[PDB]
């Protein structure tokens, strides 16, 4: 009946960090700021939800006595982030509830009954594969920063995934700017489609990218209701979807490109930077002046002055610039909208394919044939 | 005709001046270009900074320029040096290898004037004894701004000695250094922004080992910080009483104790209460220490500290009886964590009269901190 388990406290602080994140108090009933602790078959299984999101995690300890109680998440987070014991003792005493113990330490702390805490969704899904955590971490930090954040743009507001001819594709677009990546899955599997709520998107992406799941697997079964992730066999994250309709981005795409610019990617991100600091809210927009010979990236900020830096020719890597171009051009863009880009692919080059002043620009990194993205430009 | 600025600066040199400019206005700064140097003008409701820096000067002259504007794009500036032009109607312009900026300027004729002051003392003593002396205070100031008599930092000379002291009506913290001049005895109230803006100028790498100059007077206080720095800052306009009573003279317990072991088991503990009820329990005996603590519909929470005359883990308690006294765990934090030493010593009386506590590696730092009921 009663619980008491002798667990390894760094791997309870890593459990409790990502249980953390999960409650989030927009609903009204206050078990759901609880953890539900269930001692069985020499595991501690860990449960939390917010009515929008089950995450289920199971970690190795001592079973000393099976069992199950619920407590307070950011209570017995708090407390068990400041032990130093390499292992705890958990025990539960009934109407004392919940017992911590390490080296002279005694912790008590209330417990609410366990029969209201929900238990998991059940999936029945329509399409089920395997990559790597280190994979769907890329195709995740390759698209979050363009998810819109408008709440009327209801179908941007998540990462759209989808499976099309066996690859695995996460897209996401703001009615600004498009990011795409993919990967090859290994077993033929039939197309489907979902869309990920931004929050479930932050939440696994902190979870595939901790060491311990790094260099493993994550299982992703995807139905019409419900998506699934199943990280490393012991973690497993169940996440409602967004109720829309994920626009053709393939469209969105440019096909036919004029010019080319290809730069060193960290002075172009650094010179971006430092040009638009003179910038306001309301006028977001650094210009690139783009000639064979050199680009000059300046900006204009109402009632503070303007800026400008150039960036000549150069075939040496540390300094590179090449423009390819018929004409000459000058096109502005959102400052934030190229760095977003240019922080997401670690690579020493990037790639620039521009048309028309209003038609967007394709960004590329010759690193990362995988990963797409357009941004549209603004009047300067 | 005119008179336009031109300064040729070391970039890293402008970045660390920028730095204390930004801090004083959380608004413009005035450049002042002459004799060489570059002088750097920053103002609050409380406090008047100039800073001089060596500059390559071209052409004199002066103007004001947005201070949040003029830092943000410096301390972007990858450059070893800048030059700095006025053209007027285009503003300061910035100019580095490959780029330039141009900043629009304001009227020099509006900006403010530093005041006089006519010192009544005047005394020198090290920058880090004088960032002791704030650490070792700032914390306990009193936070109702109506309370003039308590809001500020006290800094006063008494018979040749130089005090910091604060109080909030819970604690006390009295800091002094021995003045190697002899001086006549004067007192001020150091506002507490005042307070916090020199500290940062002390604890930095270019002052950290020089001098600092404080100049008193009755209505402002100066500080000279390594010939280069001048702060000068209004005062707190009331009387700080005489706190040397506070001091409890009649103790019967004395807790020696190692303060990192102290301080960190006082924090885990805390953790289980609520804010409403701040409240560790200290239960001491000859044998043990159990610091408890209670969190209403949360929990509760003890740990216990054995005796041991071994450094890391040292615990020693003097008393007739068992004394069990509770104190606000904030409070205590403020000062273990102000001095870095290894043991603590606190003494004792009643569950209700105040602990003072000393450390006996700073035997100038003096603590009273009045307990709560548990």
């Known amino acids: 009946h009663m619980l008491k388990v002798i667990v390894?406290?760094?791997?309870?602080?890593?459990?409790?960090?990502?249980?953390?994140?999960?409650?989030?108090?927009?609903?009204i009933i206050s078990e759901l700021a609880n953890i539900k602790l269930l001692?069985?078959?020499?595991?501690?299984?860990?449960?939390?939800?917010?009515?929008?999101?089950?995450?289920?995690?199971?970690?190795?300890?001592?079973?000393?006595?099976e069992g199950e109680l619920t407590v307070s998440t950011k209570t017995l987070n708090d407390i068990v982030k400041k032990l130093p014991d390499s292992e705890l003792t958990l025990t539960d005493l009934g109407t004392t509830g919940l017992?911590?113990?390490?080296?002279?330490?005694?912790?008590?702390?209330?417990?609410?009954?366990?029969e209201s805490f929900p238990?998991?969704?059940?999936?029945?899904?329509?399409?089920?594969?395997?990559?790597?955590?280190?994979?769907?971490?890329?195709?995740?930090?390759?698209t979050k920063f363009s998810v819109s954040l408008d709440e009327t743009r209801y179908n941007l507001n998540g990462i759209y995934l989808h499976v099309k001819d066996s690859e695995f594709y996460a897209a996401s677009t703001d009615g600004h700017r498009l990011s795409v990546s993919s990967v090859v899955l290994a077993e033929k599997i039939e197309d489907f489609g979902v869309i990920l709520?931004?929050?479930?998107?932050?939440?696994?992406?902190?979870?595939?990218?901790?060491?311990?799941?790094?260099?493993?697997?994550?299982?992703?079964?995807?139905?019409?209701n419900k998506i699934k992730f199943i990280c490393n066999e012991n973690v497993i994250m169940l996440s409602?979807?967004?109720?829309?309709?994920?626009?053709?981005?393939?469209?969105?795409?440019?096909?036919?490109?004029?010019?080319?610019?290809?730069?060193?990617?960290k002075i172009f991100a650094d010179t971006i930077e430092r040009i638009a600091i003179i910038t306001v809210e309301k006028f977001r927009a650094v210009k690139l002046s783009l000639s064979g010979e050199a680009?000059?990236?300046?900006?204009?900020?109402?009632?503070?002055?303007?800026?400008?830096?150039?960036?000549?020719?150069?075939?040496?890597?540390?300094?590179?610039?090449?423009?390819?171009?018929?004409?000459?051009?000058?096109?502005?863009?959102?400052?934030?909208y190229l760095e977003d880009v240019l922080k997401a692919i670690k690579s020493d080059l990037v790639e620039l394919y521009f048309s028309s002043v209003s038609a967007p620009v394709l960004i590329k990194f010759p690193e990362s044939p995988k990963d797409?993205?357009?941004?549209?430009?603004?009047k300067v």
């Open 119 to 142: 238990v998991m969704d059940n999936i029945n899904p329509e399409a089920s594969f395997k990559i790597s955590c280190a994979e769907f971490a890329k195709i995740i930090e390759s």
């Open 240 to 265: 409602k979807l967004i109720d829309g309709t994920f626009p053709d981005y393939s469209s969105f795409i440019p096909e036919n490109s004029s010019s080319k610019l290809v730069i060193n990617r």
């Open 197 to 224: 709520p931004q929050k479930s998107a932050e939440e696994i992406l902190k979870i595939v990218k901790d060491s311990k799941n790094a260099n493993a697997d994550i299982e992703i079964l995807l139905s019409s």
């Open 39 to 65: 001692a069985k078959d020499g595991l501690l299984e860990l449960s939390s939800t917010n009515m929008d999101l089950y995450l289920s995690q199971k970690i190795g300890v001592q079973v000393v006595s």
């Open 372 to 378: 797409i993205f357009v941004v549209m430009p603004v």
């Open 295 to 336: 680009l000059e990236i300046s900006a204009i900020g109402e009632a503070r002055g303007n800026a400008k830096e150039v960036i000549n020719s150069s075939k040496e890597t540390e300094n590179f610039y090449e423009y390819s171009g018929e004409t000459n051009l000058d096109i502005g863009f959102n400052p934030q």
């Open 8 to 27: 390894e406290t760094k791997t309870l602080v890593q459990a409790l960090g990502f249980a953390s994140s999960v409650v989030e108090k927009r609903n």
């Open 99 to 114: 017992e911590i113990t390490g080296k002279n330490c005694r912790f008590n702390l209330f417990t609410l009954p366990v």
